[PDB]
Amino acid sequence: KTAKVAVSQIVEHPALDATRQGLLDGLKAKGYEEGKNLEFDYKTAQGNPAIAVQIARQFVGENPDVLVGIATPTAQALVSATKTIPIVFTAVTDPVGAKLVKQLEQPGKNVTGLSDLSPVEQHVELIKEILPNVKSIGVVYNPGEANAVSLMELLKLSAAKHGIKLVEATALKSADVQSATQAIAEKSDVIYALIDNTVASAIEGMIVAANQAKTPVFGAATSYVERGAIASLGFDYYQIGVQTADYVAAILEGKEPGSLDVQVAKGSDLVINKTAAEQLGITIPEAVLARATSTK
């Protein structure tokens, strides 16, 4: 009679924390309240792929009604640890590429949820609009994250389509992100800070290195503009969490997760960091400043 929802999250960074808060508030609006009829357990893997596996195993052994995997690596560990307990993943960039589901329509097993697939093409076109003389896009990513790998395939096709050279470096853990940024910032006209958990957890260090090379950072997430990216075009992760509660409630009420289609997030907010831009000697064009849903 108490619903038991167990939430595993690869690391605490603001986007994933907003997703988790959104889930909690959305469950409340559906009549599931902590303290009354909802036990909401939560573990962070602290960026460790190993802890992600241990969390999945511990949670599976406590027989929750629904498992929630926030971000790709923790979702992946859940899919490995159970084939029968419903899994709702959330804020996962490319669930097919991550092997969480065979396809988005009618996934058909114990797994379903929500994708935050970035519109990479739109981000490149936006970088070109803000910075019309871009020849070069720098990017740091973690090849251990299937989300980053899927995004790099989209970025490589879109860079080539627009005649833009990609300058790449990998970072295997968040403490290498600043060095990786430093290695590439002077060969790049702009750094694309993508939807990668390792980047997200070290975004301050990325920005310190970029600022030192006087290279702007364009963010795929709003949390990045908050820390000094000049602009971003990201989703609202709190609302994605709120929509995640729809899946969890439907499952708790007896729906099979495999019968629920995977939803892809839509509508990103254009945000501009005027201060950061001016410190870099950058003038954000008028047509862009006019569309800015927000403007710090």
Could you list the residues that contact ligand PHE (CB under 6 A)?
A: 15, 71-72, 91-93, 116, 147, 195-197, 200, 221
The helix (H) or strand (E) run that includes residue 141 is strand 136-141
Q: Judged by CB under 8 A, does residue 34 bind its own copies?
A: yes
Q: What is the CA radius of gyration of the chain?
A: 19
Q: Facing residues of 294 across strands?
A: 271
Output DSSP code: residue 294.
B
Q: Judged by CB under 8 A, does residue 255 bind its own copies?
A: no
Binding residues for its own copies, how many (CB under 8 A)? Answer: 12
Q: How far is the CB of 41 from its own copies (least distance, A)?
A: 6
Residue 253 assigned ligand-binding role:
no
Q: Kindly state the tokens that stand for 150.
A: 């899927």
Q: Which is nearer to its own copies, 41 or 269 (CB)?
A: 41
Q: Kindly state the tokens that stand for 108.
A: 């058909």
Residue 188 interacts with, from Zn ion, its own copies, ligand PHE, none (CB under 5-8 Å by kind): Zn ion
Give DSSP secondary structure letters for 185-238: HTT-SEEEE-S-HHHHHTHHHHHHHHHHTT--EEESSHHHHHTT-SEEEE--HH
CA distance 250 to 255: 6
Q: Which is nearer to its own copies, 8 or 115 (CB)?
A: 8
Residue 71 interacts with, from Zn ion, ligand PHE, its own copies, none (CB under 5-8 Å by kind): ligand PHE
AA identity, residue 217:
V
Q: How far is the CB of 9 from its own copies (least distance, A)?
A: 8
SS3 assignment, position 153: helix
Residue 185 assigned ligand-binding role:
yes
Q: How far is the CB of 237 from its own copies (least distance, A)?
A: 18
- Any residues with CB less than 8 A from the CB of 120 and at least 6 apart, and which? 151, 154, 155, 158, 220
Q: Which is nearer to Zn ion, 15 or 117 (CB)?
A: 117
How far are the Cα atoms of 3, 139, 257 from residue 31, in angstroms, in the given order? 11, 43, 20
Residue 188 assigned ligand-binding role:
yes
Q: Kindly state the tokens that stand for 1.
A: 């009679």
User: Which range of residues in 36-44, 92-100, 182-190, 273-281 is near its own copies by CB under 8 A?
Assistant: 36-44
Q: Judged by CB under 5 A, does residue 65 bind Zn ion?
A: no
Q: How far is the CB of 40 from Zn ion (least distance, A)?
A: 8
Is residue 251 a contact partner of residue 4, using CB atoms and an 8 Å limit? no
Q: How far is the CB of 197 from ligand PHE (least distance, A)?
A: 5
Terminal Cα distance for the chain, rounded: 46
Q: Judged by CB under 8 A, does residue 58 bind its own copies?
A: yes
Which residue ranges make up the annotated binding site for Zn(2+)? 39, 41, 105, 185, 188, 215, 261
Question: Binding site, residues?
Answer: 39, 41, 105, 185, 188, 215, 261
Site of interaction with its own copies (CB under 8 A): 2, 12, 34-36, 39, 41-44, 46, 58
| Residues at the contact surface with Zn ion, assessed by CB under 5 A | 39, 41, 188, 215, 261
